[PDB]
Design an enzyme around this catalytic site. Sequence first.
Site, PDB file in Angstrom:
ATOM      1  N   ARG B  59     104.970  63.579  34.858  1.00 19.92           N
ATOM      2  CA  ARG B  59     105.838  64.561  34.175  1.00 19.92           C
ATOM      3  C   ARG B  59     106.371  64.076  32.801  1.00 19.92           C
ATOM      4  O   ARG B  59     106.719  64.900  31.941  1.00 19.92           O
ATOM      5  CB  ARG B  59     106.993  65.060  35.081  1.00 19.92           C
ATOM      6  CG  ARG B  59     108.095  65.902  34.327  1.00 19.92           C
ATOM      7  CD  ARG B  59     108.758  66.976  35.211  1.00 19.92           C
ATOM      8  NE  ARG B  59     109.108  66.395  36.495  1.00 19.92           N
ATOM      9  CZ  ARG B  59     110.170  65.619  36.680  1.00 19.92           C
ATOM     10  NH1 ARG B  59     110.992  65.370  35.661  1.00 19.92           N
ATOM     11  NH2 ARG B  59     110.406  65.096  37.874  1.00 19.92           N
ATOM     12  N   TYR B 112     104.526  86.200  18.097  1.00 21.96           N
ATOM     13  CA  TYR B 112     103.928  86.394  19.412  1.00 21.96           C
ATOM     14  C   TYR B 112     105.007  86.918  20.360  1.00 21.96           C
ATOM     15  O   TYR B 112     106.130  86.393  20.396  1.00 21.96           O
ATOM     16  CB  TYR B 112     103.389  85.064  19.911  1.00 21.96           C
ATOM     17  CG  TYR B 112     102.691  85.096  21.239  1.00 21.96           C
ATOM     18  CD1 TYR B 112     101.492  85.777  21.408  1.00 21.96           C
ATOM     19  CD2 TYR B 112     103.213  84.400  22.323  1.00 21.96           C
ATOM     20  CE1 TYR B 112     100.839  85.776  22.614  1.00 21.96           C
ATOM     21  CE2 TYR B 112     102.569  84.405  23.552  1.00 21.96           C
ATOM     22  CZ  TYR B 112     101.380  85.090  23.683  1.00 21.96           C
ATOM     23  OH  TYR B 112     100.754  85.075  24.903  1.00 21.96           O
ATOM     24  N   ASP B 184     104.064  77.359  14.180  1.00 21.94           N
ATOM     25  CA  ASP B 184     103.060  77.669  15.203  1.00 21.94           C
ATOM     26  C   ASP B 184     101.705  77.823  14.536  1.00 21.94           C
ATOM     27  O   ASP B 184     101.479  78.781  13.787  1.00 21.94           O
ATOM     28  CB  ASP B 184     103.428  78.939  15.941  1.00 21.94           C
ATOM     29  CG  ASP B 184     102.422  79.300  17.057  1.00 21.94           C
ATOM     30  OD1 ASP B 184     101.256  78.792  17.039  1.00 21.94           O
ATOM     31  OD2 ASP B 184     102.814  80.134  17.933  1.00 21.94           O
ATOM     32  N   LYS B 209      93.939  78.690  23.293  1.00 24.37           N
ATOM     33  CA  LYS B 209      93.048  79.463  22.429  1.00 24.37           C
ATOM     34  C   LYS B 209      91.941  78.527  21.819  1.00 24.37           C
ATOM     35  O   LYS B 209      91.292  77.791  22.594  1.00 24.37           O
ATOM     36  CB  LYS B 209      93.849  80.219  21.383  1.00 24.37           C
ATOM     37  CG  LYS B 209      95.183  80.709  21.989  1.00 24.37           C
ATOM     38  CD  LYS B 209      95.099  82.122  22.617  1.00 24.37           C
ATOM     39  CE  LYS B 209      96.328  82.355  23.464  1.00 24.37           C
ATOM     40  NZ  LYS B 209      97.474  82.491  22.527  1.00 24.37           N
TER      41      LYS B 209
END
Lengths: 392, 396
Positions: B59, B112, B184, B209
């Site tokens: 983690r 987005y 981004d 993507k």
Amino acid sequence: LPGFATRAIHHGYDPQDHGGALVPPVYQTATFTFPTVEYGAACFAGEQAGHFYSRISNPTLNLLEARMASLEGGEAGLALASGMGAITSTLWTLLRPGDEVLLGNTLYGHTFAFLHHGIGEFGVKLRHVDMADLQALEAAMTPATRVIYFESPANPNMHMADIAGVAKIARKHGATVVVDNTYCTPYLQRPLELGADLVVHSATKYLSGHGDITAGIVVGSQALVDRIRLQGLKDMTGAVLSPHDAALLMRGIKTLNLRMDRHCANAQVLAEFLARQPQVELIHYPGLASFPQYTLARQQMSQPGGMIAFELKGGIGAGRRFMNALQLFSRAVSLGDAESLAQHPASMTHSSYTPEERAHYGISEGLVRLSVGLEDIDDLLADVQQALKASA
Amino acid sequence: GSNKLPGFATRAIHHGYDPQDHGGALVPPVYQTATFTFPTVEYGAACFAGEQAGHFYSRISNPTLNLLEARMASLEGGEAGLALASGMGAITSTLWTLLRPGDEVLLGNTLYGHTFAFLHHGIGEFGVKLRHVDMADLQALEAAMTPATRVIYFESPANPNMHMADIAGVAKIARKHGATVVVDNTYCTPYLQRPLELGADLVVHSATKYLSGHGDITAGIVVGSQALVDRIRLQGLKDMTGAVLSPHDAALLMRGIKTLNLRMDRHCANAQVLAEFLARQPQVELIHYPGLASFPQYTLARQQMSQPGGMIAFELKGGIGAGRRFMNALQLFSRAVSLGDAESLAQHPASMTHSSYTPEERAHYGISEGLVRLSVGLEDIDDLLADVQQALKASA
Ligand SMILES: N[C@@H](CCS)C(=O)O
Ligand SMILES: N[C@@H](CCS)C(=O)O
């Protein structure tokens, strides 16, 4: 109503629906297509209860969620990238500035850090209270109280909580009760059955069983789980569980009953053994008669679990010597793997601190925690025995 | 001589890994392990105290992820990387770490959808102030800065209009008032555009993507200074999101990165040939593609993107209904949200993403009834041309 083993193997899946495949196929896909723009339109409001983008609704993950929902006896399930995934997504959606969360006196370290150093810093009010003390709990409620959160049994000393007790109290105030059931698994304890609203799981631990995956589960009522999926996960956390890891979690779930039996049998033995040790000050194992909440424990857990905590007579030094000498247990944080694990927080996790801070958090100087694995109990005994020799 | 940076492709295939340190394994083994163990209780005492090097729990840090992180950092031109379970995991981990009640975020005019949701219905409901601003207008942005402004966050090119910002302009203004700029960078990837080289403090990616390229994994990346990436790793990810990336998925992300330069060149060559063809068809009212002189910010695209990308937007004549009829005639594109797959994707927000809204609130969001968005993939161009031409004819 099929039995737990049956359900853990078969629930929610008919091979005849998927080409005859015994094991369901893994939908390692990011996106889904549509036959028409019409069939597209339907899936951005949601009328044909099914599949949506894979960051919302992948079949593989849905199968996992349904199975876990079956096992915990709840309406609905949500799979997430990690146990923190599950707890952060739940709280971020349930709480807002000015709301209050009541917390069990002690908490998994990272949960504590989330509450005091995360949402807590965003105007959410924290209070810690003993959750086995129903009067202290009642008196702690305020109009602001919207969530009550705790583990049972609770790290560090296996201190239980009265789940149904607290739940009576939460009903009188419409508060949501959320239980971290990581230690017990739906196999040993089903908090929803005892009146909690939601359970969370670090599936990384017992549910996976083999320490190769990080994963999180939330189970509860359709409305709550709905909001957490669409707000917590989708918007606030993005803790998306990979389909490959979901499949492996399922593969691990198929032996839950069998592994937890062994984990317990192994712990029972190790604990009657530790209980008689003169290097041993004190011991916390739900299955000893000396366990202060023994009756409450037997009321909530069908078996006493795979975890043991004990305090060694000689403090930090003994703790160190004991840890170093193990050849079969591995020094590691974590629990619920096939491998047996140990930690001695005083000289490991909470090393940087000092005696007085460690007392504040109930971390005794010589406190060691064992995650008892599935190795042969004679091998586990020899290792603990020699490690005790070195601790002098 | 040897102080020359290796080429981008070289670094994409090799950076951070020498087979000789894992027994000759050409491909790094994948650490599909949740926990790590300690030889001595002292060795691990230091791993919770900054003295020693290693990993505690997958983690927080893991060798498969660390390599992926170091490669991405090298490609972006930044100091450190961090790998998370998704784009949103990257974005939320970053903003949860950087913002507190009373702080303000300046945002680009459009975003987005889940980023917009996170901000307005998530972090914003928690005491953090939001303001939108045309990032293409440096005069307006300067004007918008206040002493409460902690971060400036935006996509370039932005969803869904490909509106662009001047990254170096924004950074200049930010260095003057003292705000952290996060960009981004999903649409470009580091192969076409490197915001950190232009002065941004952090870039985030939906690696789901183009970086992945094969639509089989969901994954997020953040890259920036060692000191901010660590904060994010240790506060955003560990404590506030738990958006942990699976090492299996990270191995696939790394596999996809190995062909990024090639995939991107072909996405772009394809889209360019598509865009030029669409600009010249009777049914096409309007066309947005950065490689076309008619693109409103043509000049910023050339200046900032080494190539014009795989995204095309274009408006149809015939109204929503032409759109429907177009979308439905498609036999090689698939109807689907998303981008940066090998497969060509189309979407018609009117009769899809934004289908519940009436013709009014769609024109209210800059979104035509004839708008369609294309993510052009890696299929044979004639096949793509042929499918789109047969589909325009249908929407007649
Ligand atoms: N639950 C274990 C490890 C998770 S990081 C612990 O208490 O340290
Ligand atoms: N980024 C793409 C797909 C993610 S859902 C979009 O703009 O819809």
